[PDB]
Amino acid sequence: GTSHLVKCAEKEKTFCVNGGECFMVKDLSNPSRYLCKCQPGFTGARCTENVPMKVQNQEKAEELYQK
């Protein structure tokens, strides 16, 4: 952390699914903010969808979510 946060764990990442980077603080003003960072390889919301990247990449048309 090198700061103050402490990040949840493998037994507390429930706010989200897998990987993600769940976070909880200790004393401040309104700690307990469970939020997860979807690490490179996750998306959707709480990382419940292993970014199945299947659309244009090197400049081109589109199809998936991107209209």
C-alpha atoms as a printed R data frame, in Angstrom:
   type eleno elety resid chain resno       x       y       z
1  ATOM     1    CA   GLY     A     1   0.000   0.000   0.000
2  ATOM     2    CA   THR     A     2   2.785   2.426   0.892
3  ATOM     3    CA   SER     A     3  -0.030   4.718   2.019
4  ATOM     4    CA   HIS     A     4  -2.856   3.900   4.419
5  ATOM     5    CA   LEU     A     5  -5.322   1.561   2.725
6  ATOM     6    CA   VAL     A     6  -4.921  -2.150   3.447
7  ATOM     7    CA   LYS     A     7  -6.888  -3.811   0.645
8  ATOM     8    CA   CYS     A     8  -9.196  -6.693   1.482
9  ATOM     9    CA   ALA     A     9  -8.056 -10.270   0.896
10 ATOM    10    CA   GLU     A    10  -8.891 -13.617  -0.647
11 ATOM    11    CA   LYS     A    11 -11.429 -14.156   2.126
12 ATOM    12    CA   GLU     A    12 -12.971 -10.698   1.764
13 ATOM    13    CA   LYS     A    13 -12.949 -10.067  -1.996
14 ATOM    14    CA   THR     A    14 -16.611 -10.939  -1.857
15 ATOM    15    CA   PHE     A    15 -17.632  -7.388  -2.682
16 ATOM    16    CA   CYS     A    16 -16.461  -8.565  -6.057
17 ATOM    17    CA   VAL     A    17 -15.685 -11.902  -7.664
18 ATOM    18    CA   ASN     A    18 -12.149 -13.000  -8.517
19 ATOM    19    CA   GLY     A    19  -8.989 -10.867  -8.868
20 ATOM    20    CA   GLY     A    20 -10.259  -7.346  -8.500
21 ATOM    21    CA   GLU     A    21  -8.735  -5.161  -5.788
22 ATOM    22    CA   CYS     A    22 -11.216  -4.822  -3.031
23 ATOM    23    CA   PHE     A    23 -10.504  -1.994  -0.571
24 ATOM    24    CA   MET     A    24 -11.323  -1.081   3.004
25 ATOM    25    CA   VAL     A    25  -9.970   1.727   5.151
26 ATOM    26    CA   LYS     A    26  -9.203   2.101   8.850
27 ATOM    27    CA   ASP     A    27 -10.542   5.261  10.513
28 ATOM    28    CA   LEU     A    28 -10.788   8.467   8.454
29 ATOM    29    CA   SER     A    29 -14.347   9.744   8.039
30 ATOM    30    CA   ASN     A    30 -16.359   6.949   6.457
31 ATOM    31    CA   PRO     A    31 -14.161   3.869   6.126
32 ATOM    32    CA   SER     A    32 -15.306   0.434   5.023
33 ATOM    33    CA   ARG     A    33 -15.659   1.539   1.420
34 ATOM    34    CA   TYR     A    34 -15.623  -1.852  -0.287
35 ATOM    35    CA   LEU     A    35 -14.599  -1.132  -3.876
36 ATOM    36    CA   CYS     A    36 -12.735  -3.408  -6.278
37 ATOM    37    CA   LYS     A    37 -10.375  -2.396  -9.069
38 ATOM    38    CA   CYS     A    38 -10.837  -4.702 -12.005
39 ATOM    39    CA   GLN     A    39  -7.288  -5.629 -12.740
40 ATOM    40    CA   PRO     A    40  -5.982  -5.885 -16.310
41 ATOM    41    CA   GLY     A    41  -8.019  -8.870 -17.450
42 ATOM    42    CA   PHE     A    42 -11.421  -8.003 -15.970
43 ATOM    43    CA   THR     A    43 -14.437  -5.813 -16.741
44 ATOM    44    CA   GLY     A    44 -18.230  -5.826 -16.728
45 ATOM    45    CA   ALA     A    45 -18.683  -4.424 -13.219
46 ATOM    46    CA   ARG     A    46 -17.024  -6.180 -10.406
47 ATOM    47    CA   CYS     A    47 -14.821  -8.236 -12.663
48 ATOM    48    CA   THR     A    48 -17.346 -10.920 -13.309
49 ATOM    49    CA   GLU     A    49 -16.471 -11.060 -17.007
50 ATOM    50    CA   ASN     A    50 -12.952 -11.982 -18.078
51 ATOM    51    CA   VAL     A    51 -12.816  -9.274 -20.785
52 ATOM    52    CA   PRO     A    52 -13.375 -11.563 -23.790
53 ATOM    53    CA   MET     A    53 -12.021  -8.814 -26.070
54 ATOM    54    CA   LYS     A    54 -13.534  -9.730 -29.435
55 ATOM    55    CA   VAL     A    55 -13.771  -6.500 -31.425
56 ATOM    56    CA   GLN     A    56 -11.774  -4.134 -33.630
57 ATOM    57    CA   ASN     A    57  -8.345  -3.283 -32.201
58 ATOM    58    CA   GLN     A    58  -6.079  -1.560 -34.725
59 ATOM    59    CA   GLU     A    59  -8.519   1.130 -35.882
60 ATOM    60    CA   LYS     A    60 -11.497  -0.243 -37.770
61 ATOM    61    CA   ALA     A    61 -15.246  -0.829 -37.643
62 ATOM    62    CA   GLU     A    62 -16.956  -2.209 -34.541
63 ATOM    63    CA   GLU     A    63 -19.456  -4.862 -33.453
64 ATOM    64    CA   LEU     A    64 -19.541  -5.798 -29.761
65 ATOM    65    CA   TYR     A    65 -20.608  -3.326 -27.065
66 ATOM    66    CA   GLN     A    66 -18.953  -0.586 -29.105
67 ATOM    67    CA   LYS     A    67 -21.512   0.473 -31.712
